[PDB]
Amino acid sequence: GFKQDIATIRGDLRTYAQDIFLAFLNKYPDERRYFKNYVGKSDQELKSMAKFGDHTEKVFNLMMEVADRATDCVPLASDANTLVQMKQHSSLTTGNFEKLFVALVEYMRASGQSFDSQSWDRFGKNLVSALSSAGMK
Numbered sequence: 187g188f189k190q191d192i193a194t195i196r197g198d199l200r201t202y203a204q205d206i207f208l209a210f211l212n213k214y215p216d217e218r219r220y221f222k223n224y225v226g227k228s229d230q231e232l233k234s235m236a237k238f239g240d241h242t243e244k245v246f247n248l249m250m251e252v253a254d255r256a257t258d259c260v261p262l263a264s265d266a267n268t269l270v271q272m273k274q275h276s277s278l279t280t281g282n283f284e285k286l287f288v289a290l291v292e293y294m295r296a297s298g299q300s301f302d303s304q305s306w307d308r309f310g311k312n313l314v315s316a317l318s319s320a321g322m323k
């Protein structure tokens with residue numbers, strides 16, 4: 187289930203973080219505009235860039251923290267608040283987040299693995315609701 191998925195992802199966080207992030211950019215290529223240093227770079231070039239792996243892992247580490255603190259896939263309002271208030275997220279809308287979770291769920295469904303993909307979808311929906319309430323447009 188969802189708790190196991192957090193363990194699966196954490197077990198190999200660098201790989202999963204990079205592969206899910208690339209799945210997101212692949213499905214929604216216009217989203218790459220938010221990451222100015224990754225424009226025009228192949229996947230292998232990206233993986234050779236210190237901050238690509240480091241920062242992408244940090245994104246997913248926080249995601250796993252928020253996921254683990256949730257109850258029945260309902261995130262803490264304080265965690266939603268953190269995400270809204272981050273300077274790096276100042277121009278984002280909840281739609282950016284829903285796209286990430288759509289790509290993440292698609293990735294899970296296509297993987298050779300028994301992720302609780304329905305739960306990740308529901309967590310994404312609940313997170314979008316919480317982001318909206320905390321002030322994200």
Ligand code: HEM
Nearest residue numbers: 217220221240241244245246248249274275278282283286
């Ligand atoms: C629940 C989902 C998300 C979480 C937990 C999260 C978390 C984080 C964290 C921890 C950082 C700091 C990375 C660092 O400087 O090392 C970050 C940066 C950033 N995030 Fe988010 N993020 C999420 C979703 C998104 C989405 C959907 C977008 C846009 C499509 C986005 C855009 C950015 C950008 C542009 C940065 C700065 C990139 C950098 O300095 O390398 N994030 N995020």
